[PDB]
Structure 1
Amino acid sequence: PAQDNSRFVIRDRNWHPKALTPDYKTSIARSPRQALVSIPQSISETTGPNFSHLGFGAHDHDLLLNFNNGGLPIGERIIVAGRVVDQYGKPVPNTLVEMWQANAGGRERHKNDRYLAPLDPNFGGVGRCLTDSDGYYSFRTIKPGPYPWRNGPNDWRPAHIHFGISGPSIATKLITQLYFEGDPLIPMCPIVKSIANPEAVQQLIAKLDMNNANPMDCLAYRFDIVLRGQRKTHFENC
């Protein structure tokens, strides 16, 4: 069973977005009005699931092949890779990375998505992967397109990929969005502007990585994710 040997560096809630960010309209009715209650970390918060024996299908990380109904998805072929480290710069091995996204025209494969850009019959939009010993993960997918949504009357989400990362405990679990370098829609989105500090926005942006590209084939983006720093307990209960 899991043991209480770690402590995680407290989260900086002025760095992450606040709960109430009115320009993102849906946050108004879905943000708590009472202060969060702080509690010490116990074995309930410092352990979490290990997905090492989850049985992964061979194409679960490969979006160009895991849906497949006859051929290839239409759109810019890309590798999105990176590494997961903790705030002390220590690789986080064997952790679960899940991702989901729209198709090349910003349509998502979901019933409630009624945007008029057609579905791509060979694209599903979902992958999962386990980081390796060094904290590396990689996916192969098509770059998604931006799409409109009912927020302000002409709001458009920049092209993005959602990420969910487990880390070593439920204290480190995080869901975020990756964005693409240079997309001029980035500073105008109210969801990205829920982040008050511009240096925090920068961490959400995948940089073009021509070193990892496959020539005559696909480009590559690099996105490194930093989870809460983990340290051994010292001097507790005396």
Structure 2
Amino acid sequence: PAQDNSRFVIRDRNWHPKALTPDYKTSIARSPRQALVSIPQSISETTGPNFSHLGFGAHDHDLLLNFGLPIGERIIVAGRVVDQYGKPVPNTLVEMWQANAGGRYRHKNDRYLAPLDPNFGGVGRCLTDSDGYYSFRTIKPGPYPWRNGPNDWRPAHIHFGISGPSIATKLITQLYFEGDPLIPMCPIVKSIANPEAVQQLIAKLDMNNANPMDCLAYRFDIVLRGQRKTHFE
């Protein structure tokens, strides 16, 4: 079984978006009114699942093959998962989901008038290698209208979920694309008060990683809470 041999650097709750960000209407009713109760880290908090033995399909990370070919911009989304100390996070679970080229999701609840793509599901999973590296092959998702203000559009994004070494490190986020004009207008993006924090969510065009005559590539590194050994406890 797991062992309590680590401590995770405390989260900076002014970096991350706050719970109540009124412009993002749903956050109104879905945010606590009481302050969070801080508690010391214990084995309960400092351990988490290891997905090394999950049986991954061969195309789990290839959205082009996992659902003919999807319509849209062929891109590789790659990067690395590190901790705050800059140490790689190997064998970690990276799960992603997104819409198709037209901003339509393959989900019951998605009523957007843009059509589904017969060859696209929009789900991917990949386990980081020994150097904390991950990669997915997909199509660049389209922006989509949503019922917030009368004319809100989510910038093109890819939903990301990362396990890390403990439940303490577990994070759900969104990757955005470099130069997209919708970014600065999105209320969800703006849930993040520090423009500097916003930058961390922008994947950069990576020409070096592209397959000439085939697909472009984007680079998105992910930093998880810093992991250190216990001391003088």
Question: Structures share a fold, TM > 0.5?
Answer: yes
How far 1:208 moved relative to its partner?
Answer: 0.1
Structure 1 segments of 4 or more deviating over 4 A?
none
How far 1:141 moved relative to its partner?
Answer: 0.3
How far 1:211 moved relative to its partner?
Answer: 0.2
**Counterpart in 2 of 1:55?**
55
Any idea what SS the aligned residue of 1:175 has? strand
How far 1:62 moved relative to its partner?
Answer: 0.0
How far 1:125 moved relative to its partner?
Answer: 0.3
How far 1:184 moved relative to its partner?
Answer: 0.1
How far 1:43 moved relative to its partner?
Answer: 0.2
Superposed CA deviations along residues 166-204 of structure 1, whole A, max 9, x for unmatched, are 000000000000000000000000000000000000000
Distance across 2 between alignment mates of 1:60 and 1:148: 28
Superposed CA deviations along residues 95-120 of structure 1, whole A, max 9, x for unmatched, are 00000000000000001100000000
Any idea what SS the aligned residue of 2:45 has? helix
State the number of aligned residues.
233
TM-score (norm: length of structure 2)? 1.00
Distance across 1 between alignment mates of 2:108 and 2:52: 32
Any idea what SS the aligned residue of 2:207 has? coil
Aligned 1:1-238 pairs, distance under 5 A: 1-67=1-67, 71-236=68-233
Q: Percent identity?
A: 100
Distance across 1 between alignment mates of 2:109 and 2:81: 33
How far 1:80 moved relative to its partner?
Answer: 0.2
Name stretches of at least 5 consecutive residues in structure 1 with no aligned partner: none
Distance across 2 between alignment mates of 1:165 and 1:34: 27
Superposed CA deviations along residues 132-190 of structure 1, whole A, max 9, x for unmatched, are 00000000000000000000000000000000000000000000000000000000000
How far 1:231 moved relative to its partner?
Answer: 0.2
Distance across 2 between alignment mates of 1:16 and 1:131: 24
Distance across 1 between alignment mates of 2:53 and 2:43: 22
Distance across 2 between alignment mates of 1:112 and 1:185: 23
How far 1:90 moved relative to its partner?
Answer: 0.1
How far 1:64 moved relative to its partner?
Answer: 0.2
